[PDB]
């Protein structure tokens, strides 16, 4: 089985950026797609788009990076320095609105799945709701 599709996606993103890929595919799913929008909107990823790799529906995620760098190891600083799955199958994590975390004093973001749709920790706070704490990104 795959067990945790969302985690699989975060990891493909993590693994790809670590070797500086142009883009990367991830078996497509509505829910996953909602996550991506947040990433795009937040400027963590250039953007994404649906694709039909060999008949099946995927999602090209276009990764972002900093500028080339000085000295040895000119590799660019990452835009997505961290992407961690919080809630997981067999150990779900839910939070009330007053329990929503503040990733890196605001520099980061937390992605919650609320009954008002998928939102960022700020969005959720604004709409005054809580939900499943999907993951954190910074």
Partner 1 sequence: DFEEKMILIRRTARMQAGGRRFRFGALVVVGDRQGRVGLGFGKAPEVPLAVQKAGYYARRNMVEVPLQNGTIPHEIEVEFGASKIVLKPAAPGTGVIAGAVPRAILELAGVTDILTKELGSRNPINIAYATMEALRQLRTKADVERLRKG
Partner 2 sequence: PKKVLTGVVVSDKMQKTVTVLVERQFPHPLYGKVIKRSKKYLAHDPEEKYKLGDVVEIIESRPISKRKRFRVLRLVESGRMDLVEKYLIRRQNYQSLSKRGGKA
Binding site for RNA (CB under 7 A): 1-5, 27-32, 34, 55-57, 89-90, 92, 94-99, 113-118, 128-132
Residue of 1, 2, 19, 107 that binds partner 1 (CB under 8 A): 107
The site that binds partner 1 (CB under 8 A) totals a number of residues, namely 11
Question: Which one of the spans 13-21, 35-43, 55-63, 89-97 is the region binding partner 2 (CB under 8 A)?
Answer: 89-97
At residue 135, what are phi and psi to the nearest 5 degrees?
Answer: -175, 170
Residue 110 interacting with Mg ion (CB under 5 A): no
**Which partner, Mg ion, partner 2, partner 1, none, binds residue 93 by CB below 5 to 8 Å per kind?**
partner 2
Q: Is 98 in the site for partner 2 (CB under 8 A)?
A: no
Q: What gap in Å lies between CA 137 and CA 90, rounded to an integer?
A: 22
Considering only residues 17, 44, 112, 119, which one is a binding residue for partner 1 as defined by CB under 8 A?
44
Least separation in angstroms between CB 92 and RNA: 6
Residue 93 makes contact with partner 2 by CB under 8 A: yes
Question: What's the token pair of residue 43?
Answer: 């400027």
């Amino acid at each position: 089985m795959l067990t945790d599709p969302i985690a699989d996606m975060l990891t493909r993103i993590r693994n790809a950026t670590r070797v500086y890929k142009e883009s990367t595919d991830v078996p497509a799913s509505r829910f996953k797609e909602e996550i991506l929008r947040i990433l795009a909107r937040e400027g963590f990823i250039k953007g994404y788009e649906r694709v039909d790799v060999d008949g099946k529906p995927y999602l090209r995620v276009y990764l972002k990076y900093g500028p080339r760098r000085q000295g040895p190891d000119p590799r660019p600083e990452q835009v997505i320095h961290h992407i961690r799955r919080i809630s997981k199958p067999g150990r779900r994590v839910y939070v009330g609105v007053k329990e929503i975390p503040r990733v890196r004093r605001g520099l980061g973001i937390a992605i919650l799945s609320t009954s008002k749709g998928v939102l960022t920790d700020r969005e959720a706070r604004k709409l005054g709701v809580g939900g499943e704490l999907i993951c954190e990104v910074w």
